[PDB]
Structures are given as C-alpha cells and as structure tokens.
Swiss-Prot record:
UniProt: Zn(2+) 16 binding residues: C364, C377, C384, H387
Organism taxonomic ancestry: Viruses, Riboviria, Orthornavirae, Pisuviricota, Pisoniviricetes
Occurrences of domain ExoN (ranges): 39-208
Binding site for Zn(2+) 14: C128, C131, C147, H150
Catalytic residues as annotated in Swiss-Prot or TrEMBL: D57, E59, E112, H189, D194
The encoding gene: rep
Binding-site residues, S-adenosyl-L-methionine: D252, I253, G254, N255, P256, K257, A258
Name of the featured protein: Guanine-N7 methyltransferase nsp14
Function: Plays a role in viral RNA synthesis through two distinct activities. The N7-guanine methyltransferase activity plays a role in the formation of the cap structure GpppA-RNA. The proofreading exoribonuclease reduces the sensitivity of the virus to RNA mutagens during replication. This activity acts on both ssRNA and dsRNA in a 3'-5' direction.
Length: 423
C-alpha cells in the first residue's frame, strides 16, 4: 500500500474539523505524529492476516478505548502511561497463539488515529530480544523489543498495522451497515461495541460476501492432525453405516472436489456439488434422495433429511483456529479461511448424535477392554494388540476432531450392534 495513495477524510471531519479533503497516507501518518513502508495496508494484505484483526474504536466527550476483545479502557479512568501497559498485555495474550502482528480494524472518525501516538512506536522491522519472531512490542524501561510471547512488562505497541473500513466505499454510518448483515452484536454506546461491529463488518465483506479459497494461512496449531483425524473418522463412520444398513446408494452432497471416502464399498456412489456456504445455511429444498443414505460432510443445510450421515462444524467452539464471525457464524482458518453459518441445533432434529465406536475387519496381526472396540478380537473375548493400538489411535483422532469443534450426527436407526455379524 503506497504511502502516496489517497485517503478519504470525510469520516474524520467531525473529530478533526477542517481536515483537508486531499490527503495521502504519507500526510495522515505525519498528522498522527509519526520493512515497514506504511502503517496502513491493503484489503488483500489484511485478508492474508485476518488472524491479526483487532477492531478498535476511540470515543470522546478524556477518552474511551474499545477493542473487539470486549475491553474498554478510559485514558485520562487512568493516565496513558498505565493504559499502554494494559494494551500491550491484552494484545499479546489475544494474539500470541494467532499471529505475528496486530492489524487494527477501524471505522475511523479521528480520535482513534490521534490516540495512537500515545501507545504506539514505529521503526525498522526488528526481531524479538528473546527469540526469532518479529517484534510487536517495545519497552522504554530496557530499550528492548519483543514478540507477543515475550512482551511481559513491555509498554508500547511496535509497528502495528491498521486498515480503515470506511475507505471501502460505504454509505451511512457503522451500525446501519453492520446491522444489514448481523443481529448478534448490539450498539450499547460503549467503544468496544463499535470495535466489535467494525471487525464483524470487515469479516462479512472479506469472507462472507467475498470468498477466496486460494489464500493459504500459516500453521499455528493442530491443523494437520485435525484434518487427518477428519479423514480417518469420515472413512470409519461411513464404512460402518454401509455395513450395518447396506444402503444400495449413497448421495454425497458437498464439495465438488470430493473423492469416495470408502472406495471399496459395494454401493452406488453419486456426487452432488455444493461449495461451502459462507453466508446462510443451504435450504434442503433448493439442494434437493430418499433412497439409501445422504452424506453431508461439512455441507451445512438448515434441516438434514432423516436418512443422513452428517459432520457439521460447531461455530461456538473456542480454539485458535476459530475466529469470531458474522451473525453468529465463525471464521474457521485451517489452511484456508471458511466463514461458517451459526450452529443451529434444530438442523439435526431428524437425526441423533453419533456415538463413538471403532470398527475394524483387518486381520489380528502385529491390555484393552472396551465395549466400543468392534473387532473379531473382542467378539471372541480378547482384543489383540494390533487392534488395541489402532483403537487407541482412532480414539485420539476422534477426540481431536470433536474438540476442534466438529460434531457428528446420524440417522436414528444406526445401531453399532449390527456390525458384529459382519465377523
Ligand atoms: O458513549 C460512548 N462511549 C462511552 C464514552 N465514555 C467517555 C469518557 C471517558 C469516560 C467518552 S465516550 C459511545 C458512543 C458511541 C457511538 N457509536 C455510534 C455513533 C453514534 C453514531 N460508541 N460508544
Ligand atoms: Zn519472542
Ligand atoms: Zn456483527
Ligand atoms: Zn484383533
């Protein structure tokens, strides 16, 4: 983002009367008092760094500093020299396991930008004094720099980034634009409410209305183990449903790039294309199947049919992979960014929770007691060691997937008792 790019200033002219209409980022940054070519960034760079987004609003009358973490600080009610210490602590704790930077998302009216100099220092890109991550904070006590992990006691935010949502060409104020898409965040006339709304609207614009599944996001947690667990569980559960109930046809509704998850199964496999719905859940009436079984693997519909196998992401889950989203939805970032419509328990009324089970027909070849280890093994009274090992690996994956937020549902007649006679 060129510092010579033009910045529209109408939003700022109520806090800053007489501000020039003709303004560049270069001159704004100067007016604000200030590897790092611009404090501001493009919508594209911002999207690549969605994990760093912290909505931010400042409201005057002595100022109130609201952030999308729900926090409201008053700077005078306490002086700035303590308020900046709290800001560093809050952002470091919020972001250390998410991103290597902060990106302040704004609906800029002026106070938020003029307040920055009181808690931000800028300069050349640097590295942490105690590790190799880029520096995000600075301390004036020790003249040293630190990342989010090592910033305890540090008092200034260092080389923050920011983006003003009002530059994207909106009509009317923040609430009137946010409420067009979202009924979950209110307008309680505290600064944090605006900050939360600002981020929500930004997420809606970049991930609900606009979608880019080509953007990749760095590994920050159990991504790989989780995705592997999901493939393992998917194969297990679908294979067992075909054996227990012997459906003649399976209707695989969802990703157009889907491959048969149980390739050796007898059934007639029919695919139906539906991209991840990022806004509202698909209506099963538009999508549509009563023959056999329907596989909705992360295909969010509003009411699943009774003859389904379903894996559905639970947006309420607290994890580093799952960011708060728009209108109760969540932004699940695991390699790619998937805004997900809000979890709705009623979608599953025709189904039941799927119980844990492990099923294997593999030879017993290389002490576990479990009623859910479904193997010739246990049928004959004593689980062999190989199936004990596999059982404990599968449980681990299964638990990994559930705790990552996924939930599993199945048709009501599913009964693992029917699998024992496949031995
Ligand atoms: O009164 C708001 N904060 C509370 C505040 N305490 C202070 C003093 C330090 C104690 C200053 S301000 C507030 C007002 C809004 C309005 N946002 C939407 C605009 C109206 C279209 N947001 N927060
Ligand atoms: Zn560090
Ligand atoms: Zn919202
Ligand atoms: Zn065995």
């Amino acid at each position: 983002l060129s510092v010579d790019t033009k910045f529209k200033t109408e939003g700022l002219c109520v806090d800053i009367p007489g501000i020039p209409k003709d303004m560049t980022y270069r001159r704004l940054i100067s007016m604000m008092g200030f590897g790092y070519p611009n404090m501001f960034i493009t919508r594209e760079e911002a999207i690549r760094h969605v994990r760093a987004w912290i909505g931010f609003d400042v409201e005057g009358c002595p100022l109130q500093l609201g952030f999308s973490t729900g926090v409201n600080l008053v700077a005078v009610g306490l002086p700035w020299n303590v308020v900046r210490i709290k800001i560093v602590q809050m952002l470091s704790d919020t972001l250390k396991n998410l991103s290597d930077r902060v990106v302040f998302v704004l609906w800029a009216h002026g106070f938020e930008l003029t307040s920055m100099k009181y808690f931000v220092k800028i300069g050349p890109e640097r590295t942490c004094c105690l590790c190799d991550r880029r520096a995000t904070c600075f301390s004036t006590a020790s003249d040293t720099y630190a990342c989010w992990h090592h910033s305890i006691g540090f008092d200034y935010v260092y080389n923050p980034f920011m983006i003003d949502v009002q530059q994207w060409g909106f009509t009317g104020n923040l609430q009137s634009n946010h409420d067009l898409y979202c009924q979950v965040h209110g307008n309680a006339h505290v600064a944090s409410c605006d900050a939360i709304m600002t981020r929500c609207l930004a997420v809606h614009e970049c991930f609900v209305k606009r979608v880019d599944w080509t953007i990749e996001y760095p590994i920050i947690g159990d991504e790989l183990k989780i995705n592997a667990a999901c493939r393992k569980v998917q194969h297990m559960v679908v294979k067992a449903a075909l054996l227990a109930d012997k459906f003649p046809v399976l209707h695989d509704i969802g990703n157009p790039k889907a491959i048969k998850c149980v390739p050796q199964a007898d059934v007639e496999w029919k695919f139906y294309d539906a991209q991840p719905c990022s806004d509202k859940a698909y209506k099963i009436e538009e999508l549509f199947f009563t023959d056999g079984v329907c596989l909705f693997w992360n295909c969010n519909v509003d009411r699943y049919p009774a003859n389904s196998i379903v894996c559905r992401f639970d947006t309420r889950v607290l994890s580093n992979l799952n960011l708060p989203g728009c209108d109760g939805g969540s932004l699940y970032v695991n390699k790619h960014a998937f805004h997900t419509p809000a979890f709705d328990k009623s979608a599953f009324v025709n189904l039941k929770q799927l119980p844990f089970f492990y099923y294997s027909d593999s030879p017993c070849e290389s002490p576990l007691k479990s009623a859910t280890c479904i193997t010739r093994c246990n049928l004959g009274g004593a689980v062999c060691r190989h199936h004990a090992n596999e059982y404990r690996l599968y449980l681990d994956a299964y638990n990994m997937m559930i705790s990552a937020g996924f939930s599993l549902w199945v048709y009501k007649q599913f009964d693992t008792y029917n699998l024992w006679n496949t031995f």
